[PDB]
Every structure is written in structure tokens, then in C-alpha cells.
Design an enzyme around this catalytic site. Structure first.
Site, PDB file in Angstrom:
ATOM      1  N   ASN A   1      -5.770   5.635   3.315  1.00 43.88           N
ATOM      2  CA  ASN A   1      -6.796   5.642   2.321  1.00 43.88           C
ATOM      3  C   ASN A   1      -7.523   4.308   2.318  1.00 43.88           C
ATOM      4  O   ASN A   1      -6.946   3.311   1.834  1.00 43.88           O
ATOM      5  CB  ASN A   1      -6.133   5.794   0.997  1.00 43.88           C
ATOM      6  CG  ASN A   1      -7.096   6.072  -0.120  1.00 43.88           C
ATOM      7  OD1 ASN A   1      -8.267   6.459   0.068  1.00 43.88           O
ATOM      8  ND2 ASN A   1      -6.610   5.875  -1.314  1.00 43.88           N
TER       9      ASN A   1
ATOM     10  N   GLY B   1      -1.737  -1.056  -5.068  1.00 45.82           N
ATOM     11  CA  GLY B   1      -2.622  -2.209  -4.885  1.00 45.82           C
ATOM     12  C   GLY B   1      -1.986  -3.545  -5.311  1.00 45.82           C
ATOM     13  O   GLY B   1      -2.553  -4.616  -5.048  1.00 45.82           O
TER      14      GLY B   1
ATOM     15  N   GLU C   1      -8.004   6.084  -9.497  1.00 46.82           N
ATOM     16  CA  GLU C   1      -9.285   5.536 -10.001  1.00 46.82           C
ATOM     17  C   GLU C   1     -10.039   6.610 -10.757  1.00 46.82           C
ATOM     18  O   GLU C   1     -10.803   6.347 -11.709  1.00 46.82           O
ATOM     19  CB  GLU C   1     -10.172   4.921  -8.892  1.00 46.82           C
ATOM     20  CG  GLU C   1     -10.853   5.873  -7.891  1.00 46.82           C
ATOM     21  CD  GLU C   1      -9.829   6.580  -7.009  1.00 46.82           C
ATOM     22  OE1 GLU C   1     -10.096   7.679  -6.489  1.00 46.82           O
ATOM     23  OE2 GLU C   1      -8.738   5.984  -6.848  1.00 46.82           O
TER      24      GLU C   1
ATOM     25  N   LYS D   1     -10.057   2.311   0.710  1.00 45.12           N
ATOM     26  CA  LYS D   1     -10.715   2.270  -0.610  1.00 45.12           C
ATOM     27  C   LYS D   1     -11.856   1.204  -0.668  1.00 45.12           C
ATOM     28  O   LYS D   1     -11.609   0.002  -0.627  1.00 45.12           O
ATOM     29  CB  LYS D   1      -9.679   1.975  -1.718  1.00 45.12           C
ATOM     30  CG  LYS D   1      -8.519   2.989  -1.766  1.00 45.12           C
ATOM     31  CD  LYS D   1      -7.539   2.632  -2.847  1.00 45.12           C
ATOM     32  CE  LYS D   1      -6.718   1.440  -2.420  1.00 45.12           C
ATOM     33  NZ  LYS D   1      -5.621   1.299  -3.373  1.00 45.12           N
TER      34      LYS D   1
ATOM     35  N   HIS E   1      -6.256  11.027  -7.749  1.00 44.65           N
ATOM     36  CA  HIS E   1      -6.000   9.646  -7.436  1.00 44.65           C
ATOM     37  C   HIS E   1      -6.300   8.705  -8.629  1.00 44.65           C
ATOM     38  O   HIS E   1      -7.145   8.975  -9.498  1.00 44.65           O
ATOM     39  CB  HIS E   1      -6.744   9.239  -6.174  1.00 44.65           C
ATOM     40  CG  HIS E   1      -6.099   8.106  -5.470  1.00 44.65           C
ATOM     41  ND1 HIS E   1      -6.594   6.826  -5.524  1.00 44.65           N
ATOM     42  CD2 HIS E   1      -4.972   8.037  -4.737  1.00 44.65           C
ATOM     43  CE1 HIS E   1      -5.790   6.016  -4.860  1.00 44.65           C
ATOM     44  NE2 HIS E   1      -4.801   6.730  -4.369  1.00 44.65           N
TER      45      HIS E   1
ATOM     46  N   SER F   1       1.790   0.378  -2.491  1.00 44.00           N
ATOM     47  CA  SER F   1       2.225  -0.724  -1.648  1.00 44.00           C
ATOM     48  C   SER F   1       3.286  -0.464  -0.601  1.00 44.00           C
ATOM     49  O   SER F   1       4.176  -1.280  -0.375  1.00 44.00           O
ATOM     50  CB  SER F   1       2.589  -1.936  -2.507  1.00 44.00           C
ATOM     51  OG  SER F   1       1.512  -2.156  -3.435  1.00 44.00           O
TER      52      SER F   1
ATOM     53  N   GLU G   1       2.560   8.196  -6.929  1.00 44.05           N
ATOM     54  CA  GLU G   1       2.181   6.795  -6.896  1.00 44.05           C
ATOM     55  C   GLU G   1       2.316   6.210  -8.276  1.00 44.05           C
ATOM     56  O   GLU G   1       1.432   6.353  -9.113  1.00 44.05           O
ATOM     57  CB  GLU G   1       0.733   6.673  -6.402  1.00 44.05           C
ATOM     58  CG  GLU G   1       0.502   7.350  -5.080  1.00 44.05           C
ATOM     59  CD  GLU G   1      -0.819   6.935  -4.385  1.00 44.05           C
ATOM     60  OE1 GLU G   1      -1.903   7.359  -4.862  1.00 44.05           O
ATOM     61  OE2 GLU G   1      -0.777   6.236  -3.332  1.00 44.05           O
TER      62      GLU G   1
END
Lengths: 246, 246
Positions: free
Chosen positions: B9, B169, B95, B11, B93, B209, B163
């Protein structure tokens, strides 16, 4: 003196084939791009197909750009758009404000990032039906325009678009006089905040159910410099809207 | 047996040149795509470039799709994606949920839209730091998964991704045992709502991560079937993450 600007906005619409057919029909119109700007704003994933099919006389752009902090919102960044040589971006369009609650402050920030990355920006604003009934049109527009217009540097590279929300996608278009009155005021706001030469250079387009029947009376108005065109831009007769500005 | 699945992914980043060099390094890895799924999810306007550059052994996808309403949100539709032959879509996801207030009902609808258009869906969910500190992990996960899991039909074509939000991140990866425990409970939700055979077929990935140092100890766990990888998938060493699953 100022160059007219006609833009197609293809909103959540298209297939590979339909774009192929539509681009071919647009390509059959001869116009001089040094005289008239004509820009097509496809869906993001159709950008490359669309650029590849449209002749160099047509400019192209994307429909949104992000603000601009590490935390990725999943929007296309201005840096990405520059690296792909995307010439134009739309900012502040109805759906960003309605669905994604985008603010005037966001709009300013997006313009900043677009200019920092050498993108030309089509910046949209307009009042709601309620605001128009409540006699608040000028107040709304004034607040929206002054959120960002002082950032403008080269006045060929930022295009303002007045789109009353009640006209967008509804078939209910502003009369030429309704539009003119607002455009005249918008240009005065540019004059008082950026200068006279600049206000007279900048393009101010109308959008909101522009079609082949109404485009000639709109563009005739003195402070209306072209159009952002949604539904009507999906048909081959869009060429006649372009011709209205030739 | 259950087929492993490793996803990149990308981003809000890349350039034409960075993708060229990265895709090249990826294409140097020999793997068998009948034995291992490897999917790359680029920024929307990089989809075409990326797909042209990646060999066929890589699958590709987009990072978001819209719900089925006549007023265009600016998101790509399932219909457009199918017409482009985009194989996969990410749904739910972080965001989308954070920046755009995308709900579980929205996630259900996107999954419905995707499956109606023959798209395979990578559906993400996970708890907050606050939720986990408040001992609410399993309750949160359960609500999120039960929102859509019943719609699943072919259990190769929907992939679940845990996740935890605090791992995405941040560098702060879940331990193998933290993830494993959740994955077991997810798989049980699936067994209970969809059937035991179906639960043993569905892939449940971990994301947050994942890196070259931790990926082996994560994939070894019984109910972790692969990864959705952000920051690590922008490096040429991502091949080593794919190798932990070969």
C-alpha cells in the site's frame, strides 16, 4: 483581452469505450488553443486514458488535490500531480464541501499547495438555495472568495468558478443576469484585494447546468469568461458549448 | 491449503521514476503467483503506470471505492474499476474511517458494491490505543467484522485485515501474540457466522508496521495469513517481506 476557458467535468462517469468515443468527437473540433483554453477533468483512474486520447489542443486536470503532514488522507498530492504533469486541479467543488465537509480554510490551503507545485487551479464557490432565498448570495460569495484570492500570483493560472449549488446537476440554471451580477461583484473583490490589472486578467466562469441552449446568453455577459460543465460535457454536443466561446 | 497474501500500500507517494525503480526491483523476485498472492495498491493516478510496469505475477488494486446515489462523491465507482479490470479494492482502511467518517454501514455497502461488480475486497478494521487500553479490543473488532462478514460469498475473494490503529505508520508493531490472539477470534467470528470450511479458507492478514525484521515471526503464527504493508512496501527490501511468505 482575456482568454475564455471552457471545462468538462466528468463526474463519477465513464468507461474506456465511452471515453474513446467522446474524446474522438471532441478531437474533431478545430479550435486554436492559443486563443481558447479547453480543459477536461476526468475521474482520477481515467486520467491517463483520457490524456492519451485527447489531442494536445485540449488541456487536462484532476478533480481534487490534498492539503499540504505525513498522515495520508488518500487524496492525490500536488507533488504527485506535478510529477505526472497534470496541468490543472479543481478546488472547492460542491461535493468536497457537501460530503467531505471541506472548508474555506481547506480551500486556501489546497490553493497554496497547488501554487507551490506549479499547478493551475480552478477554484469553485457558490451559495445554497436557502442562502439565495435568505438574500445572502453576495455575503456568502464574498466570504468564500476572500478565503483564498490574496494568494493568487499569476492571474492566468487561477480561474474562479461561480456555481450556485442549486444549479449544479439540477437543470436549474442561473439566468445571465443572476450570474453577471455575481461575477461583477467577484471581479470587484479581486480588484479591491489584488489590483485592477489582475482583476481584469482573471477568468471567472459560470457553472451550474450550462448546456447548448443556454451557453450563448451566458458567455455574452461581460464578466462571464466561460464555463465549468458537468452533465452536458458527457455528450458529443459539448463541442457546441466550446464553439459558443470561440 | 490456505494461500498466503502480501499487499503493498503506497500511501500518498511515489513519482514516475521512484515507481520505475521500485517495480523493477519487485519484478526481479521470482515467485509463483499460483502459490502466493502479491498485490500492489498505488495512488489512483499512478494505477496505470504501476500496472504497466509490474509483471503479471503481481496483482493490483485501488485504495478506495465508492458506495453505490446520483450525486457524485468524487470517489472511483466499483463499475469504473471493473471496466478498468482493477482486481482488488481496499475497504475500511484507517484514513477513510478517520478523515472521512466512513462507518461500518458504509463499509458493508462498499463491500456489497464491490462484490456486485466482481471486485475482490481487502477489508480493514482494528481498535484504537484508547480502546485497547480500556480492554475493549475484542468487542470493537467483533462489531466491525460482523458489520459485513455475512456478505462474503467466495472466501478466496474477500481478505480481512487486522490493523490496530496504534500500529499503523508508527513503527509500533503488534507482537506476534497480540495479533495472533485477535486473528483467532476473527476466524471464530467467521466460523460462527459463515461456516467452518469458509473460516478455514478466508485469509486474515495483519498490518501495522510490518517490516523485514518482524515479518517472519508474524507469518509463523497460525491465524496470520499475510500482510498489508505501508512504509516498508516503498523500499526495495519489500521483496524480503514477500519472501517470508513463500
Amino acid at each position: 483581452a482575456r482568454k475564455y476557458f471552457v471545462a468538462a467535468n466528468w463526474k463519477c462517469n465513464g468507461t474506456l469505450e465511452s471515453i474513446k468515443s467522446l474524446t474522438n468527437s471532441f478531437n474533431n473540433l478545430d479550435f486554436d488553443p492559443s486563443k481558447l483554453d479547453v480543459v477536461v477533468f476526468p475521474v482520477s483512474v481515467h486520467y491517463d486514458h483520457t490524456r492519451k486520447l485527447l489531442q494536445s489542443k485540449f488541456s487536462t486536470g484532476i478533480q481534487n488535490v490534498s492539503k499540504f503532514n505525513g498522515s495520508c488522507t488518500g487524496e492525490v498530492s500536488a507533488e504527485i500531480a506535478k510529477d505526472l504533469n497534470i496541468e490543472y486541479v479543481i478546488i472547492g467543488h460542491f461535493e468536497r464541501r457537501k460530503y467531505f465537509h471541506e472548508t474555506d480554510e481547506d480551500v486556501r490551503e489546497k490553493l497554496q499547495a497547488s501554487l507551490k507545485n506549479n499547478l493551475k487551479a480552478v477554484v469553485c464557490f457558490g451559495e445554497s438555495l436557502e442562502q439565495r432565498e435568505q438574500n445572502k448570495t453576495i455575503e456568502v460569495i464574498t466570504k468564500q472568495v476572500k478565503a483564498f484570492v490574496d494568494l493568487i500570483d499569476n492571474f492566468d493560472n487561477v480561474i474562479l468558478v461561480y456555481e450556485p449549488l442549486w444549479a449544479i446537476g439540477t437543470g436549474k440554471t442561473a439566468t445571465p443576469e443572476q450570474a453577471q451580477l455575481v461575477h461583477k461583484e467577484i471581479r470587484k473583490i479581486v480588484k479591491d484585494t489584488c489590483g485592477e490589472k489582475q482583476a481584469n486578467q482573471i477568468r471567472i466562469l459560470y457553472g451550474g447546468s450550462v448546456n447548448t441552449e443556454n451557453c450563448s446568453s451566458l458567455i455574452q455577459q461581460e464578466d462571464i469568461d466561460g464555463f465549468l460543465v458537468g452533465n452536458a460535457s458527457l455528450k458529443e454536443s459539448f463541442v457546441d458549448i466550446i464553439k459558443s466561446a470561440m
